[PDB]
Protein backbone atom coordinates (compact mmCIF):
# COMPACT_ATOMS: atom_id res chain seq x y z
CA UNK A 1 0.00 0.00 0.00
CA UNK A 2 1.64 3.21 0.89
CA UNK A 3 5.03 2.03 2.11
CA UNK A 4 6.13 5.50 3.14
CA UNK A 5 5.03 8.33 5.32
CA UNK A 6 6.23 11.96 5.30
CA UNK A 7 6.41 13.47 8.81
CA UNK A 8 7.10 16.99 10.14
CA UNK A 9 8.51 18.06 13.51
CA UNK A 10 8.02 21.72 14.49
CA UNK A 11 8.91 24.47 16.95
CA UNK A 12 5.80 23.68 19.01
CA UNK A 13 7.24 20.25 19.72
CA UNK A 14 4.66 18.69 17.47
CA UNK A 15 4.64 15.89 14.91
CA UNK A 16 1.97 16.35 12.22
CA UNK A 17 1.02 12.68 12.58
CA UNK A 18 -0.27 10.65 15.51
CA UNK A 19 -0.99 7.33 13.83
CA UNK A 20 1.04 5.26 11.40
CA UNK A 21 -0.29 2.15 9.71
CA UNK A 22 2.23 -0.19 8.10
CA UNK A 23 0.68 -2.40 5.42
CA UNK A 24 1.71 -6.03 6.00
CA UNK A 25 2.36 -6.16 2.22
CA UNK A 26 5.32 -3.77 2.32
CA UNK A 27 8.72 -5.48 2.49
CA UNK A 28 10.18 -2.21 3.78
CA UNK A 29 8.64 0.94 5.19
CA UNK A 30 10.04 4.45 4.97
CA UNK A 31 9.62 7.53 7.15
CA UNK A 32 10.61 10.91 5.71
CA UNK A 33 11.13 13.35 8.56
CA UNK A 34 11.47 17.08 8.04
CA UNK A 35 11.80 20.13 10.28
CA UNK A 36 9.81 23.19 9.11
CA UNK A 37 10.70 25.14 12.27
CA UNK A 38 13.36 27.85 12.80
CA UNK A 39 15.08 26.43 15.86
CA UNK A 40 18.40 24.50 15.73
CA UNK A 41 18.57 20.88 16.82
CA UNK A 42 20.27 21.70 20.09
CA UNK A 43 17.13 23.48 21.35
CA UNK A 44 14.38 21.93 19.23
CA UNK A 45 15.95 18.84 17.72
CA UNK A 46 13.68 16.11 16.44
CA UNK A 47 14.12 12.50 15.57
CA UNK A 48 11.67 9.74 14.77
CA UNK A 49 12.36 6.67 16.88
CA UNK A 50 10.40 3.44 16.80
CA UNK A 51 10.00 0.80 19.52
CA UNK A 52 7.27 -1.36 21.00
CA UNK A 53 4.80 0.75 22.98
CA UNK A 54 6.28 -0.97 26.03
CA UNK A 55 9.94 -0.13 25.39
CA UNK A 56 9.28 3.55 24.75
CA UNK A 57 9.90 4.84 28.30
CA UNK A 58 13.32 3.26 28.84
CA UNK A 59 14.42 4.35 25.38
CA UNK A 60 13.33 7.94 26.05
CA UNK A 61 14.81 7.91 29.57
CA UNK A 62 18.22 6.51 28.56
CA UNK A 63 18.20 8.61 25.42
CA UNK A 64 17.96 11.88 27.33
CA UNK A 65 20.93 10.78 29.45
CA UNK A 66 23.08 10.12 26.38
CA UNK A 67 23.49 13.68 25.10
CA UNK A 68 23.17 15.55 21.81
CA UNK A 69 26.35 14.07 20.33
CA UNK A 70 24.59 10.71 20.62
CA UNK A 71 21.31 11.97 19.15
CA UNK A 72 19.66 11.47 22.51
CA UNK A 73 19.78 7.73 21.99
CA UNK A 74 21.60 5.28 24.19
CA UNK A 75 24.30 3.64 22.11
CA UNK A 76 23.52 0.16 20.94
CA UNK A 77 19.99 0.25 22.46
CA UNK A 78 18.28 -2.97 21.24
CA UNK A 79 14.78 -1.67 21.84
CA UNK A 80 15.17 0.75 18.95
CA UNK A 81 13.59 -0.93 15.94
CA UNK A 82 14.44 2.03 13.68
CA UNK A 83 15.38 5.68 13.95
CA UNK A 84 16.17 8.78 11.92
CA UNK A 85 18.95 11.04 13.17
CA UNK A 86 18.23 14.15 15.22
CA UNK A 87 17.47 17.14 12.97
CA UNK A 88 17.04 20.89 13.35
CA UNK A 89 15.41 23.70 11.35
CA UNK A 90 15.61 23.28 7.59
CA UNK A 91 16.94 19.74 7.84
CA UNK A 92 15.51 16.42 6.68
CA UNK A 93 16.20 12.71 7.06
CA UNK A 94 14.65 9.39 6.08
CA UNK A 95 14.71 5.93 7.62
CA UNK A 96 13.80 2.69 5.91
CA UNK A 97 13.33 -0.49 7.91
CA UNK A 98 12.37 -4.12 7.20
CA UNK A 99 8.67 -4.73 7.79
CA UNK A 100 9.62 -8.21 9.07
CA UNK A 101 11.05 -6.56 12.21
CA UNK A 102 7.41 -5.90 13.17
CA UNK A 103 4.70 -8.37 14.15
CA UNK A 104 0.91 -8.14 14.09
CA UNK A 105 -1.07 -7.35 17.25
CA UNK A 106 1.82 -5.81 19.13
CA UNK A 107 1.46 -2.07 19.55
CA UNK A 108 4.34 0.21 18.56
CA UNK A 109 5.12 3.82 19.39
CA UNK A 110 7.10 6.38 17.44
CA UNK A 111 8.55 9.30 19.31
CA UNK A 112 11.25 11.94 19.59
CA UNK A 113 13.92 11.38 22.22
CA UNK A 114 15.02 15.01 22.58
CA UNK A 115 14.57 15.90 26.32
CA UNK A 116 10.90 16.41 27.16
CA UNK A 117 9.61 16.12 23.60
CA UNK A 118 8.17 12.61 23.83
CA UNK A 119 5.42 13.97 26.07
CA UNK A 120 3.84 15.77 23.04
CA UNK A 121 5.89 14.26 20.21
CA UNK A 122 4.79 10.64 20.11
CA UNK A 123 2.36 8.44 18.29
CA UNK A 124 1.07 5.04 17.33
CA UNK A 125 2.32 2.54 14.73
CA UNK A 126 0.59 -0.75 13.97
CA UNK A 127 1.16 -3.56 11.50
CA UNK A 128 -2.05 -4.04 9.54
CU1 LIG B 1 1.80 -0.30 -2.43
CU1 LIG C 1 11.78 16.57 19.18
UniProtKB/Swiss-Prot annotation:
Xref: InterPro entries: Azurin (IPR014068), BlueCu_1 (IPR000923), BlueCu_1_BS (IPR028871), Cu-binding_ET (IPR050845), Cupredoxin (IPR008972)
Keyword match Metal-binding: yes
Bridged cysteine pairs (disulfide): 3-26
Any one GO molecular function term: copper ion binding
Family annotation (PROSITE patterns): COPPER_BLUE (PS00196)
Residues annotated to bind Cu cation: 46, 112, 117, 121
Keyword Electron transport: yes
Alphabetical UniProt keywords: Copper, Disulfide bond, Electron transport, Metal-binding, Periplasm, Signal, Transport
Residues annotated as domain Plastocyanin-like: 1-128
GO CC terms, sorted: periplasmic space; plasma membrane
Matching CDD domains: Azurin
Main subcellular localisation: periplasm
Localization of this protein: Periplasm
Function: Transfers electrons from cytochrome c551 to cytochrome oxidase.
Protein name as it appears in the record: Azurin
Amino acid sequence: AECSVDIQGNDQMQFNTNAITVDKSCKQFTVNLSHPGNLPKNVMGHNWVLSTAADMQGVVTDGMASGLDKDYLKPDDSRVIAHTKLIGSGEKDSVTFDVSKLKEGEQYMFFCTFPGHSALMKGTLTLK
